[PDB]
Design a protein around this ligand. Structure first.
Ligand SMILES: O=c1[nH]c(=O)n([C@@H]2O[C@H](COP(=O)(O)OP(=O)(O)O[C@H]3O[C@H](CO)[C@H](O)[C@H](O)[C@H]3O)[C@@H](O)[C@H]2O)cc1-c1ccccc1
Ligand SMILES: O=c1[nH]c(=O)n([C@@H]2O[C@H](COP(=O)(O)OP(=O)(O)O[C@H]3O[C@H](CO)[C@H](O)[C@H](O)[C@H]3O)[C@@H](O)[C@H]2O)cc1-c1ccccc1
Ligand SMILES: [Mn+2]
Ligand SMILES: [Mn+2]
Lengths: 278, 278
């Protein structure tokens, strides 16, 4: 039960956005700026005392990205909510000392030091950390570390399972998507199938759904490995196969996964929220 | 896990509908024709073996509406899915013998023979039938009987909690909504609050959410009764107060609750699905 709130009346006969698709054919929202009232969403999630886990791998030289990643997450990611960052690294002492807002904590998880890094992210999330995540957070968001937050990323993304439109392909036809196309791979998608091309750098959902997705991707990747085949874009190829067959309940627009150096700032993007570091 | 399916690729940069709002500010879809691919939704719900309960009251002279209500439900309501109709009447022998498709059954529940009819629908759904519904169906849809189905009403409506835009008010400002305006009533909504005006004739959701909603509306109605006040539109006024404070997870367009005699067939309605009997 939400408290009284005063905000602009939604207007049934006035679309919020007319330039973009805001709902998928299986009735999941596609989250763009203008489509949500964050005050309502914040109330709904706070009333449940929601905790959001953020997983990020920073192995070898990639530890250098953590300072900007974490400082910008503090400014823009789930502010006002409980957050638990899980940083997986082979160099725990290289993790920067970043000051965190109240209600936010960071755990460093030490791992060994691409195909094999790829398999290990799915393996780590689905197998090794399974019990810890179920006990500690409500939702999990799994992201690349070579990124920074430049604008709000909040509870508008939360749902049982979400994927994010890859910023290279949101305007493409399915035939141009770089899905795995060899039928010998568990990630195979035929040319006449496919809704969207989802980016491997930002996906998430409830803990139970994220564990299901990463367990499935890991099992598929191990089958391919035993069959001597490696999918074209590795874990991203398996993520796409999974989300084709298990539709996500929210799709995030490329506001949530962008690269301004390669793609600029198109009129359709009203906010660049989470962006590649050039 | 859905099977392979071949259907038109959704296009991110081509909205499905540009004339109407297709998502609420709390990211619930607003279900209009063109927004959903029923083949995908049918697959998702069948794979869960979904059972849909349909409740309808037909007391006194209103038993005369059951023949057309039920015959048209057989042609258009959840066809292909398991359905259990629950018909509440003071005249069980007046219930028409309507032939049902496979997987569909009808139970007649005998009750006693407006304020008090109104209270009794909420009471009946929340209290008397509580255990039976939890054991027998996954979702419950509660409708008026003076209605007929004229076109598809399917699993695109199913979600934890839905309400339907009342067809008289979908283009109105919140100040014109006929919410209960006296602060002495539990259904009171101030002039600056309100998202939509939902119709009392078609609402539903998972069994647990529908039981929560009808239990809350019944409790509120009893408080008003003890305080000597009756809300302006009875159970509909309390439904509106509930859905203002507990946002629905899907909103149905007025395609799902229409009256062609009073309102015609506007260009914005591509299908008239469930309609008043003139
Ligand atoms: O030494 C590493 N250390 C490390 O921590 N990583 C993590 O993996 C992420 C993905 O690598 P990245 O260099 O960012 O490649 P992208 O092209 O942006 O990755 C996309 O494609 C991948 C395909 O398998 C993934 O799906 C990834 O999620 C995508 O964004 C990084 O952000 C890090 O979090 C990756 C590497 C790495 C190891 C070998 C080759 C290239 C990178
Ligand atoms: O003798 C009845 N028998 C009966 O079964 N009903 C059921 O209540 C429903 C609502 O009554 P109805 O005559 O259809 O009124 P509407 O104006 O279309 O109702 C709307 O407003 C109501 C306000 O309390 C409800 O919210 C209703 O769901 C709305 O559609 C009917 O369709 C029947 O299912 C209603 C009556 C009735 C009893 C006294 C006065 C008017 C109607
Ligand atoms: Mn990256
Ligand atoms: Mn009626």
């Amino acid at each position: 039960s939400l408290p009284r709130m005063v905000y602009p009346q939604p207007k049934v006969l006035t679309p919020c956005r007319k330039d973009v698709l805001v709902v998928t054919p299986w009735l999941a929202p596609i989250v763009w700026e203008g489509t949500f009232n964050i005050d309502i969403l914040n109330e709904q999630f706070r009333l449940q005392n929601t905790t959001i886990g953020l997983t990020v791998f920073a192995i070898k030289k990639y530890v250098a990205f953590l300072k900007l990643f974490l400082e910008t997450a503090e400014k823009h990611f789930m502010v006002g909510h409980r957050v638990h960052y899980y940083v997986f690294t082979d160099q725990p002492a290289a993790v920067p000392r970043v000051t965190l807002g109240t209600g936010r904590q960071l755990s460093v998880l030490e791992v060994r030091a691409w195909q094999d890094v790829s398999m290990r992210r799915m393996e780590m999330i689905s197998d090794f950390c399974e019990r810890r995540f179920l006990s500690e957070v409500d939702y999990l968001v799994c992201v690349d570390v070579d990124m920074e937050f430049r604008d709000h990323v909040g509870v508008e993304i939360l749902t049982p399972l979400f994927g994010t439109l890859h910023p290279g392909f949101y305007g493409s036809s399915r035939e141009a998507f770089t899905y795995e196309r060899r039928p010998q791979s568990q990630a195979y998608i035929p040319k006449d199938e496919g809704d969207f091309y989802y980016g491997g750098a930002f996906f998430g959902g409830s803990v139970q759904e994220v564990q299901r997705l990463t367990r499935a991707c890991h099992q598929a990747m191990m089958v391919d490995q035993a069959n001597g085949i490696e999918a074209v874009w590795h874990d991203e190829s398996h993520l796409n196969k999974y989300l084709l067959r298990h539709k996500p309940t929210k799709v995030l627009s490329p506001e949530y996964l962008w690269d301004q150096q390669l793609l600029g700032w198109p009129a359709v993007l009203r906010k660049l929220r989470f962006t590649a570091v050039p």
